[PDB]
Paper text:
In cytokinin biosynthesis, the Lonely Guy (LOG) protein has been recently identified as a phosphoribohydrolase that finally releases cytokinins. Based on the biochemical and in vivo cytokinin production experiments, we propose that Cg1261 is a novel type of LOG and belongs to type II LOGs (CgLOGII).
Interestingly, the electron density maps of the N-terminal region (Met1–His39) were invisible in all three molecules, indicating that this region is highly disordered (hereinafter referred to as disordered N-terminal region, DNR). Molecules I and II form a dimeric structure, which is similar to the dimeric structure of CgLOG. The hexameric structure was formed by oligomerization of three dimeric structures, and the overall shape of the hexamer looked like a trillium flower, in which each petal was made up of a twisted dimer. The α1 helices of six monomers mainly contribute to hexamerization of Cg1261. Compared with CgLOG, Cg1261 contained an extended N-terminal region, which formed an α1 helix (Asp46–Leu64).
Residue numbers in the entry:
A (entry chain A), C (entry chain A): 42 to 135, 138 to 249
B (entry chain B), D (entry chain B): 41 to 133, 137 to 249
E (entry chain C), F (entry chain C): 40 to 135, 138 to 249
Write the structure that this text describes.
């Protein structure tokens, strides 16, 4: 019965109840994603740290998936600036980083994803792999369909993201897969103050 | 406003899992096919999705789509007209295309997505926008992390997908954000029988 | 809605699902209770430690409420003998001891109590206060009513328990509140080998 | 044997909480009264429980019991015959005594117990066996830990309870397992108006 | 609360135990009762002595009757049973069965009924070392011998070193203060020699 | 995919922008277009120069037309508006509004339509320091002056130090290699004196 569907449905539920209950009081927040593999002496990591700090300076909780690399970097920045640093972890066949103040673990991928969208009001993507891209395209869809509103999307690293963005222009816009505004609405930058200000300005007057 | 609050959200989520697990319980082996909703029937990508549907049914697979128009309908048409099993898992936003034999409509994005991974053993991406991309990188990340196994990923459209693949293959691999096998494992092709035999072979002996 | 009954019922459920799921694989076990206030240099604590070790030597997991004092003592004994030491903690207006290997935290008192009874097959009470006595009388009731069977109850500390046992004889038996066997079935001892053997012997042939 | 397995246990537990929260939703202020089920109507303890029921209703309380015979029936009779609100929360093991105006039957011990703490603001213990003792030390421990507040505890029967109180007061206090106020706070008396006024006073100004 | 927990039923239960005991033991052949500590284990010298005693009693054609429990009650039951003699156990029901060497077992709720059966259906008492349960039967038989309620009822203590201090106190204090007469104590044999014990019994029963 | 994303609709949209622009600006009084970097902030000396330029242009009875964005487009709009002159902004629609000092604003999707409106409805160009958008308009007006498609159309660069290296290259390299004639470059004024700039324009427009 443990692996059968009746228990499963109950377990799924149980995980949604737990998540919603533990995050119910969350203040305004930004979710930051990026590669788990990048090390602490890398420029992207330094930026992630600086991004953490500046978001807290703008009164935002920082939410990440709680792993190492470019999840750690923004948690570290936020925590050491004495803001609220949240890590929403996932059980993988593959542990929360030491800079997560409010740590949650999720068994179900789909429950954890829902949390990011329900308890933050913008996404910033530092450079990453498939996990980062999975989140980026999900939120681009949610914005495009109106399931979330006033939800800024920012990409950090111009060198890094250029190829993807060019392809989405050069091919998806050109072929009518998306509207121009679906890609245009994203900010792509190397400037963290402008990244934060872009978020503040889109959230001004709620 | 109980209708927008958590207790009701939880019951609705449960209701959706239950309805999908019940309806999909008996599913034989299957392939999920993704692609842009906006492409019309006289387009070559559409004609290709009809023929893919047909060949998948000739290989004894059920064909699963998101249930909408365009390149979700094409494979449902192919599969349907070949007298195999055609499935559409819609999202509430419009109705299921008229070539769905087994239809379900989901309100929750994340619930629908789960059902693709649970009730099919391969993903084929026809050209598409952000909804297709979102599904592609979700599966790439499930394969990468071992959460699914023997789960082939095919992209149809060499010209369309080239530039994405080139960015992945050069940005992500070179910066060390994925391993080279993580991208090489997927098939990129315009040859539909080669796509099907790719899938068959990866499922050999189950 | 958070403090209202619909969410509450869902939360209650969620906690039962989580507990049953995490303890489902438990091997045979004994629950040990006792005072949280007793210190590590006290005779009762030494006995609790020795009790831990001997239960593991008889192939039993040791389950406690995970707090300090005479919960810690049996966890320590069991853990340092490389057996399975379980701590089932409770959120109080009042943290698991360092010798808990499998630690769970419960919001609901009634869910945590159910766990002790469902995932152990005997109770041993070291000397304690009201929390210990609450558990002792609950299990005495469950045995008396047949809700659990082959469930040995042992009290440790002859000097300590004498007054209570004498009163339950001198008054509850004499007045017909309970049958003689309801108190007689308990072993009261200072001898830990005999405490363990009493449990082994009552569990022999399942 | 789905009927003894966890999925069904969970649904049954939920069903029981829901049914109790629904039926008890509107409860005015109340006292729970405990005592042995085996004492008959011509006994003085029974006569005392009838008069206690009556006086509780004269003080504008509903009277809550476990719903069975003996010293659970006596207060239901007193309360009932004085035209106040008489409640019985039975346990499945037999039926509710005939003086219950508002009856519910529970299969789960732990669910029933919760409802006493949630839907009454004082416990009175007539002489009883292990079921009474179990409830008494549960409330003692809730009061001690701050989980309930302004929650008076009265024991009726000075002769009957003396020896328990003397053991507590000397063993537990002297060995440092409880503080002296933890036992002094309860009232032990044969005077029923003194018992009621004890409760009224502890609830003064709500 | 219950009829069962009140004097009318208690009197019926009492009667029941006398009846069942008198009925089951009525036909007993000649017999010795052996008492001693329930706590001693099978590897202790006393245990081994108890086994040999049961064996020798049966070679003298006696049934061997005990309290039917463990330790130095089981030992003489073992001895007797394994020599193909009659081994009897009259147990007392206690919180937390008869030992496996008892071949005619009865079980008593009432200590006082059980104690009557030892005096009525055996004709000698032998006390291996023991505690308060043993000392209880000893002083009862001694008072039954002194009052004449039993006649020709030899009493033997085994373990000279174990018993010496009790027997010295009884002589130096009870005799000297006139609480007993000297023959009330001189008539017990105290010895370590089991053949002498059994011979004391045989000889005491002979010429009757 | 959409009618909207195809050439028939594009041609209609193009026509629409010319029509709306020709319609709205048809009545314009005499005007100068000012260009310069969108990136400079309001505390920079160039910004302050831009404000003063707008003020002085309006005192010479010119409307002041800009690209309607921030930085050194907003500065002359501010100058002009706050002197009670006509301040015009012809914006280009870009990912991520007209500046708040624009009092006659239009917004263009098509860069090429917008660039036509600057040439058709102003009679002088002044370029504050700027980047590639600025240099683009400069070399277009210069080519329109050299080809005779506009006449009596003065061109002024502000910031002698900023512009010197461009103007030196144009003389030492384009003239010397015969790519332009020397008057094609000598006819621009380069200066830091805003009254001289405005006087160069006035004088160039006089006696016509
Ligand atoms: Cl798509
Ligand atoms: Cl193709
Ligand atoms: Cl009771
Ligand atoms: Cl009383
Ligand atoms: Cl003894
Ligand atoms: Cl000896
Ligand atoms: Cl001798
Ligand atoms: Cl520019
Ligand atoms: Cl200047
Ligand atoms: Cl000058």
């Amino acid at each position: 019965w443990k692996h059968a569907d009746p228990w499963r449905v109950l377990r799924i539920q149980s995980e949604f109840v737990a998540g919603f209950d533990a995050l119910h009081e969350m203040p305004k927040a930004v979710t930051v994603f990026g590669s788990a593999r990048i090390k602490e002496d890398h420029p992207y990591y330094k930026a992630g740290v600086e991004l953490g700090e500046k978001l807290v300076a703008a009164d935002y909780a920082v939410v990440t998936g709680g792993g190492p690399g470019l999840m750690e970097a923004p948690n570290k920045g936020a925590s050491e600036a004495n803001g609220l640093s949240v890590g929403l972890g996932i059980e993988l066949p593959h542990h929360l980083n030491p800079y997560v103040d409010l740590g949650l673990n999720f068994r179900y991928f789909f429950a954890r994803k829902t949390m990011f969208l329900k308890y933050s009001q913008a996404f910033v993507c530092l450079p990453g792999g498939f996990g980062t891209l999975d989140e980026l395209f999900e939120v681009l869809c949610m914005v495009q369909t109106g399931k979330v509103t006033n939800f800024p999307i920012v990409l950090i690293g111009t060198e890094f993201w250029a190829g993807l963005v060019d392809w989405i222009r050069h091919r998806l816009v050109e072929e009518g897969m998306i509207d121009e505004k679906d890609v245009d609405r994203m900010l792509v930058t190397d400037d963290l103050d402008q990244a934060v200000k872009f978020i503040v300005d889109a959230h001004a007057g709620l």
